[PDB]
Structures are given as structure tokens and as C-alpha cells.
């Protein structure tokens, strides 16, 4: 219940993911006149962001947001908002509508996780297209296996879209899409690079195990993840 795409060359993987994501966005724009794209942070998606930013889509009708965010000011080095502004919201995609996860202008002592989640929930729209990444621990979004909030993150009973998580093994409190939110996204992509991540992916692919949270997405009913891998 996933499709595997492998490349030798990172540049080709990035372009090929951009091409597929642009086509999925176009389908949403054709169907309903608007689209919402959620992206993940870190380094691995940057070349993809750059390629996607050049696509001649109707970006003014596309909302862009995050799958997860570090609860830090948006000018902080570890802000995914800052990441996305640097590498994606440029070229043709600069016209996209930003759907915030952390409020601009707030400093560290003004950012309290409960209030942050409440603010983010007020702006949240269900994505049409989501690009996930995966850590070496098998986590995805900020659904980290040792988070004390893990049971909340996987409880889809009330459809709640965003959850505060504490990674334990990585810095900063987080705001994450929930398993429910991911599972109900129409088009889900996963981008991963390197043999270490291919090995963890293959474990996760074996079946559901909360030790490798991406496994809960790969094995979820109704989810068909499009996986783009570069060595």
C-alpha cells in the first residue's frame, strides 16, 4: 500500500517529486479551484522545493503550510517556517497563500505550546497534497515514538488535526499533524534519501509498530503513499 520510486541522483529525485506534486496540485485546482499543500522541513526536501517553486501553477489559489513545526520564533534557525520561506516561497510559488503554524513576531517567551496549537488550529485547512519525510528513528511529521503525547497524536476519534508533541530525542516542542490528518489527505508523498533511511523504511514497511511511527501511515487503510527515494 505504497508506490516506490528510486533514483541514483538526488537532483533527478527532487525534479521528479516536484513534477508529481505539481500534477497532484493541478488536479486539485482543476477539481475545486484551490489546493492546500503541506510540506515537511529539514534538508532533504530543499532541492524539491526549489524545483516546485518554478512550476507555472496557479499559485495564488494554493495554500501552503507545514506538516509539523518547531515551536520557536519564525526567524529562529530551527523554524520550518523560515526554511520554507527561504527555499519554497520564491519564484512562481511566492504567490502562494501561507497558512501559519507559529505566529510571526512572537519571541520565545511568548510562545506557549497550548496557545500555539490553538492559533494553528484556527488557521488549519485539510491538505490536498502532503509531503512527508522520515527520521532515522522512523518518525514522520513530529509524531515521535517517545513523545508523551503519542496516544493523542494517533487518536483520530474527534478528527483533531494538530497536536503538541515533545520529541524527547530531538529539540524543541512541536506542533504536528495527527495520524488522522495525514490519513485523510488525498495525496501523500514520502521523500527519503540514503541506505540508512531505506533500511528503516523497510522495517517500517513490515507492519504497524509505534516504534517506527511512519509504519502507522504506510499501513493505514485508505492511504497509498508515493515514496521517492534517492541513494
Amino acid at each position: 500500500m505504497f508506490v516506490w520510486h528510486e533514483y541514483e541522483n538526488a537532483a533527478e529525485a527532487a525534479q521528479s517529486l516536484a513534477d508529481a506534486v505539481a500534477d497532484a496540485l493541478q488536479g486539485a485546482l482543476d477539481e475545486k479551484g484551490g489546493a492546500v499543500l503541506a510540506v515537511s522541513g529539514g534538508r532533504s526536501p530543499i532541492a524539491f522545493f526549489n524545483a516546485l517553486s518554478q512550476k507555472d501553477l496557479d499559485w495564488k489559489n494554493v495554500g501552503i503550510t507545514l506538516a509539523d513545526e518547531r515551536i520557536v520564533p519564525t526567524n529562529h534557525a530551527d523554524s520550518n517556517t523560515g526554511l520554507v520561506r527561504e527555499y519554497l516561497l520564491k519564484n512562481k510559488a511566492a504567490a502562494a497563500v501561507w497558512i501559519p503554524m507559529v505566529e510571526d513576531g512572537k519571541t520565545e517567551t511568548e510562545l506557549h505550546p497550548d496557545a500555539v496549537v490553538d492559533y494553528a488550529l484556527k488557521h488549519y485547512k485539510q491538505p490536498d497534497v502532503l509531503i512527508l519525510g522520515m527520521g532515522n528513528d522512523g518518525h514522520t511529521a513530529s509524531i515521535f515514538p517517545k513523545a508523551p503525547q503519542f496516544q493523542t497524536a494517533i487518536d483520530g476519534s474527534a478528527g483533531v488535526a494538530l497536536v503538541h508533541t515533545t520529541p524527547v530525542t530531538a529539540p524543541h516542542e512541536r506542533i504536528s499533524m495527527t495520524l488522522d490528518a495525514i490519513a485523510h489527505t488525498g495525496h501523500v508523498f514520502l521523500a527519503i534519501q540514503g541506505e540508512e533511511k531505506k533500511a528503516v523504511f523497510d522495517q517500517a514497511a513490515q507492519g504497524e509498530n509505534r516504534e517506527y511511527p511512519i509504519s502507522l501511515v504506510l499501513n493505514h487503510q485508505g492511504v497509498n503513499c508515493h515514496v521517492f527515494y534517492a541513494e
Side-chain angles (χ1 to χ4, degrees), residues 113-123 175:
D114 289 347
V116 169
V117 174
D118 284 351
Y119 169 91
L121 284 165
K122 288 175 177 40
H123 293 264
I175 178 179

Side-chain angles (χ1 to χ4, degrees), residues 63-176:
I64 300 180
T65 197
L66 300 169
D68 68 305
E69 178 59 302
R70 294 73 178 284
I71 303 179
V72 295
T74 65
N75 66 339
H76 189 284
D78 297 332
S79 176
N80 291 339
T81 295
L83 175 81
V84 170
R85 282 170 173 169
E86 178 166 11
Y87 298 108
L88 181 56
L89 302 179
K90 67 183 193 207
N91 298 316
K92 302 292 197 186
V97 178
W98 180 245
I99 303 165
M101 290 282 263
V102 173
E103 193 171 5
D104 291 329
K106 301 294 187 198
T107 66
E108 287 84 351
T109 62
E110 299 175 311
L111 287 171
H112 308 288
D114 289 347
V116 169
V117 174
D118 284 351
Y119 169 91
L121 284 165
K122 288 175 177 40
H123 293 264
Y124 177 89
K125 303 181 69 162
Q126 177 72 66
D128 300 299
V129 181
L130 165 64
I131 307 82
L132 291 175
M134 185 197 73
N136 289 332
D137 64 349
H139 90 277
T140 195
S142 278
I143 305 172
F144 282 91
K146 301 189 178 15
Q149 313 91 340
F150 191 92
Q151 292 296 121
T152 300
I154 72 168
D155 185 4
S157 58
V160 169
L162 299 175
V163 57
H164 167 216
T165 67
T166 303
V168 182
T169 59
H172 309 302
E173 303 304 317
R174 310 299 181 89
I175 178 179
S176 191

